[PDB]
RNA sequence: CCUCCGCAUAAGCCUGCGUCAGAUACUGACAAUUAACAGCCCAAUAUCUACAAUCAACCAACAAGUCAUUAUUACCCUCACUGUCAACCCAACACAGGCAUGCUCAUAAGGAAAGGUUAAAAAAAGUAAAAGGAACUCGGCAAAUCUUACCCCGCCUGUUUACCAAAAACAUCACCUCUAGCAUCACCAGUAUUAGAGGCACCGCCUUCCUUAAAUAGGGAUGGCUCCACGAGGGUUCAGCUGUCUCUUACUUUUAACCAGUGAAAUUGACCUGCCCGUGAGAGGCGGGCAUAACACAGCAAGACGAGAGACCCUAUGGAGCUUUAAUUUAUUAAUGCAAACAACCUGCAUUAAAAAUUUCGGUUGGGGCGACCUCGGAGCAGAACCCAACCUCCGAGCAGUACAUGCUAAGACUUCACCAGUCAAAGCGAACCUUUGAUCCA
RNA sequence: GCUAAACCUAGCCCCAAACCCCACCUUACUACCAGACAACCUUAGCCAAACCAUUUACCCAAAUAAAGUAUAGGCGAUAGAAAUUGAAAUGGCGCAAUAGAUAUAGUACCGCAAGGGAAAGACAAGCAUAAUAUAGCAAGGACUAACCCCUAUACCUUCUGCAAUGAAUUAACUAGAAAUAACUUUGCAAGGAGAGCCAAAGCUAAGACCCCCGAAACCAGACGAGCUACCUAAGAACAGCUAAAAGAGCACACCCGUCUAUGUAGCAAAAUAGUGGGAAGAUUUAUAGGUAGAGGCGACAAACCUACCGAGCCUGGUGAUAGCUGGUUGUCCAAGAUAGAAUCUUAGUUCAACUUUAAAUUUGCCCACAGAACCCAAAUCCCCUU
């Protein structure tokens, strides 16, 4: 097939960008995931998920303005415009973030903790232990990867040399060099649970489409089976 | 089923 | 139902030879003392109804220019004249139909 | 309801048995040898 | 007198009812659609752009909705080219079908249901119907009317077997289970309130009588439950309504029949093609009787084992599909292990899996289940050479005991009806001094 | 007397020899801007093995011979060398328009496509002249005489035998291909043969003998998503009333297809009329694109993927295979019969038995006695005669 990837855009902007839907389709034009297709046409908004991340010609700790709060279609999340110096970014909205609100995005890892107000980017071993922590980076400037989804934090569980032990909200424990940055919070959109689908036109609007043969193999889908072991073949299925 | 064949046009379309 | 044998050509002109299928011959045709033509007893000379058609057609043509539209039908009554005739005493007051041949023996 | 599968368009012709589309593939190449090979006075649609 | 028709665009088609001349909207010749409509574009590099739409003003949201421009640098010429017709396209057809959009909502546009006649049957559609009103029928199907009530199933709206099934089936919100801690081609430019897969079913809670006169019909005395609503679902019912029926009739149109024109198809061994009884297991044709001038036309459907298709059973060391604890593999992937190259990556060799791949379906017993049997020997079972009652009945043998010449050789014979195989055996040599199966290949 | 009937070269087959202006890859046949993707990779399977699973000949680089030998091989079906040896050089006991090329042409036509692929040019049948006469396989025996009389259960094939199969009819076309031995007739003869091979009368040569059509399939490589299924991009449509932001109600357009009737070679290879469901949505729909066959797609009906999908279509392997069905064409004569065993075998085959031909030789069949068991019938066997 002649499919190119919509996500081309190779510099970052504010502006929404035109997604194309796949509808589970790989390059090669066959469904590679089922059960997607149509919805609602949507615009991508690029979210800046290092949120340290100084202005060109500048560096050290920044403070910035959040414009406004938004929904955003692609993700579960309600998305943040905010505004430092002579800069505009998409972040991923804390619970409490408000339009108007000051957010601080340091690097700096103090000798104490620094006080954890929610919304604000700290290396993670400026971090109290137990605090609620999203938008967790898995090395040091990779960018946010996990605690994204709506609602979501994971806490902060122990700090010992220049490891940090994290409770992801799978409840699996995950090690990371303390001087990667998370935000302090869960993340917004904490109701996305008790959202009530009410009917099947919804997910269909939301690009889930009911979709069969989802296996492909031959038979279909098939559970495992154990196979019993030669002594144990004559208590398989004994009559009554 | 099996479908119909058609007798070629040429059988039918001749003219003195 | 389809036929369970070829019927052969001797039953089938038993069939489509019987008197039924023939033609019937015709006693009613005579010759019209008149012209000399061939007509059916009860029906009109065919050369006789032709002559009077194409006389009433032109008459009709006539007709056609003198009133000049539709629905110009005359509250009055007609009269045909040719060449060399004049509206009679009885021909007053009825719209006169001037034709350029002269009279035709058969009309009167 | 049926018979009427061919729905012409132009565009679908030429992009489907054309010549570029032909030419584009060695499989395609292929189809218009075997129909100079056969004498066919239309190699392409 | 008739039409959801017509006119345009799109798409498609490609000169396909313009003129003339020859033929019976055909052939040939001649002509024609004129751009303003439409198509055919942009000089780039950067950098820009959060703020829907819905009369966009209030109100109302969620499913969150392309609108891409500006600064600098280049730039000077100017209207080319192409579509433009038609009664049209896709359906083999001048096909009652398919066919996007804008306008007209009955036309200002576009068309003609009747070739002529007659007024049979049967057939189709329609209209009307005394009295009755479901008595019809599997069923109120259809028609006419307009209502009532309740069960079963499925929560609902949706989806499906294009062309016999629209459903109780599939989906579905809801819920549950399992798997996954993560980036630059799906999932996803997502990150556990996420994603993928499976199940289940919204939700919510608790843990003999009646009906009719007659009623095989109907209704009522983690699961168990709860039917709000909805349904061309499946049952039942009141009332009404009716040609469904008692019980059919009349009329109109189509069809029909006759006249004219044009003109198929299945089918067909040949036919000079009767009835009764008999035969055969079923007769137009055979036997015995009977009948019997010859042909049209219109009906009918008893026969012509009517025609054309199909169903049921059986078979084939015929296919194909499916499932597996059928057999054979693991080439390929995925894991490991060992070597190889110095962790990644990769090669080779193994082992385990996944996914697959290839292949098969012995015989006898109305079929199937559960069986039993399949070779050999002995007896029934064949009275008197042999052979045979297969199928079948009973019994026992895959030997045991003995000897270790119970060796070697060799005339002549028998024989399980073929062959294979299996038996007996004189003479001779040598020691001593017999009573139950299986080939070849291969090891 | 109509329809017809006939014709002979248009060409073709097998050998030999010889080695054979302009436009056009974009939507081909389109005068005129930023390339870069540029190719290489065991065939498989049908089939034979009477299944099938290892296996089962296939442009080779001198014919013959070695030799179907050595070898290989579920050592079986079958496969199969080499050393060595060393062949020379413009025609038709071909077709003559259903033949010979498919060919007048890869055209017309058919298909979306890949593909498929024609026809034809120079008094047969059927009818008419001229319908028919009781009764019957349509005739035969006849007869003065057509009929009347008497006799007479169509053909082919498959069944044990009549039922069943096929056949409208004419013309043309349409189906027994070969070795191991034998036999016969020549030649020469302990040798034959124009190297090789055979030879204890052989050797050399000739003559005689081994059909046609048909699956469902399998595999390889193409072609197909203008139908349909799903998806992508960017569009469009949805009156009126009720209701009020609704997978809301009634109901147009539009989509569908509940029930009935008509139609059933039809208007239609799924339609028509009425009725009915949805009709602001999980809606319908135009355009362009995408997913391709063991694959796709599927709100799962094994549904749909160009009218025939439990697995598309085309071409090729392919003249697949068929123990099954059907067919298998001059005349005449002669001989000619039921039968055991084994078999993944009982729809087949091989051996036996029977059968046919040729040949050699001498007994063969029938049978009178005599003879064939104890346990406790009819007949049969055997053979001097005849
Ligand atoms: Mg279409
Ligand atoms: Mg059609
Ligand atoms: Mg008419
Ligand atoms: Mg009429
Ligand atoms: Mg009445
Ligand atoms: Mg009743
Ligand atoms: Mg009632
Ligand atoms: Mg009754
Ligand atoms: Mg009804
Ligand atoms: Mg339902
Ligand atoms: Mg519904
Ligand atoms: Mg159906
Ligand atoms: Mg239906
Ligand atoms: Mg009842
Ligand atoms: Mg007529
Ligand atoms: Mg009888
Ligand atoms: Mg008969
Ligand atoms: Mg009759
Ligand atoms: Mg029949
Ligand atoms: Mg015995
Ligand atoms: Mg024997
Ligand atoms: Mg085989
Ligand atoms: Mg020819
Ligand atoms: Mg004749
Ligand atoms: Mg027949
Ligand atoms: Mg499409
Ligand atoms: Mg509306
Ligand atoms: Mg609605
Ligand atoms: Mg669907
Ligand atoms: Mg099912
Ligand atoms: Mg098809
Ligand atoms: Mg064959
Ligand atoms: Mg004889
Ligand atoms: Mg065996
Ligand atoms: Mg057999
Ligand atoms: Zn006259």
Request: a positive charge; proline letters at 6%; charged letters at 30%.
């Amino acid at each position: 097939a002649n499919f190119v990837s919509w996500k081309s855009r190779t510099k970052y902007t504010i502006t929404p960008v035109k997604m194309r839907k796949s509808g589970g389709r790989d390059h090669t034009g066959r469904i590679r995931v089922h059960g997607i297709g149509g919805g609602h046409k949507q615009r991508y908004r690029m979210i800046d998920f290092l949120r340290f991340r100084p202005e060109e010609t500048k560096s050290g700790p920044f403070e910035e303005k959040v414009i406004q709060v938004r929904y955003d279609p692609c993700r579960s999340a309600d998305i943040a415009l905010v505004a430092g110096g002579s800069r505009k970014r998409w972040i991923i909205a804390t619970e409490n973030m408000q339009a108007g609100d000051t957010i601080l995005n340091s690097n700096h890892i103090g000798r104490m903790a620094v006080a954890a107000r929610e919304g604000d980017a700290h290396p993670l071993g400026a971090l109290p232990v137990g605090t609620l922590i999203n938008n967790v980076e898995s090395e040091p400037g990779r960018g946010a990867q996990y605690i994204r989804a709506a609602g979501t934090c994971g806490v902060l569980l122990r700090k010992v040399n220049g490891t940090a032990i994290i409770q992801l909200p799978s409840k699996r424990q995950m090690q990371v060099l303390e001087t990667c940055v998370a935000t302090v919070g869960r993340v917004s959109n904490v109701d996305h649970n008790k959202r009530v689908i009410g009917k099947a036109g919804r997910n269909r609007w939301l690009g889930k489409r009911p979709n069969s043969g989802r296996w492909h193999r031959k038979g279909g889908w098939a559970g495992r089976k154990i196979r019993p072991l030669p002594p144990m073949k004559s208590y398989v299925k004994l009559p009554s | 089923f099996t479908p119909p064949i058609y007798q070629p046009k040429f059988k039918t379309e001749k003219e003195f | 139902a389809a036929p369970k044998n070829r019927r052969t050509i001797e039953v089938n002109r038993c069939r489509r030879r019987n008197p039924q299928k023939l033609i019937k011959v015709k006693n009613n045709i005579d010759v019209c003392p008149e012209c000399g033509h061939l007509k059916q007893k009860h029906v009109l000379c065919a050369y006789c109804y032709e002559k009077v058609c194409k006389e009433t057609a032109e008459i009709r043509r006539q007709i056609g220019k003198q009133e000049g539209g539709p629905f110009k039908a005359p509250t009055i009554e007609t009269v045909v004249l040719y060449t060399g005739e004049t509206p009679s005493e009885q021909d007053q007051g009825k719209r006169i139909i001037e034709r350029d041949r002269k009279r035709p023996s058969w009309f009167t | 309801a049926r018979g009427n599968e061919y729905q012409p368009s132009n565009i679908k012709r030429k992009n489907k048995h054309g010549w570029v589309r032909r030419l584009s593939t060695p499989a395609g190449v292929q189809v218009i040898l075997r129909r100079m090979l056969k004498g066919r006075k239309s190699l392409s649609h």
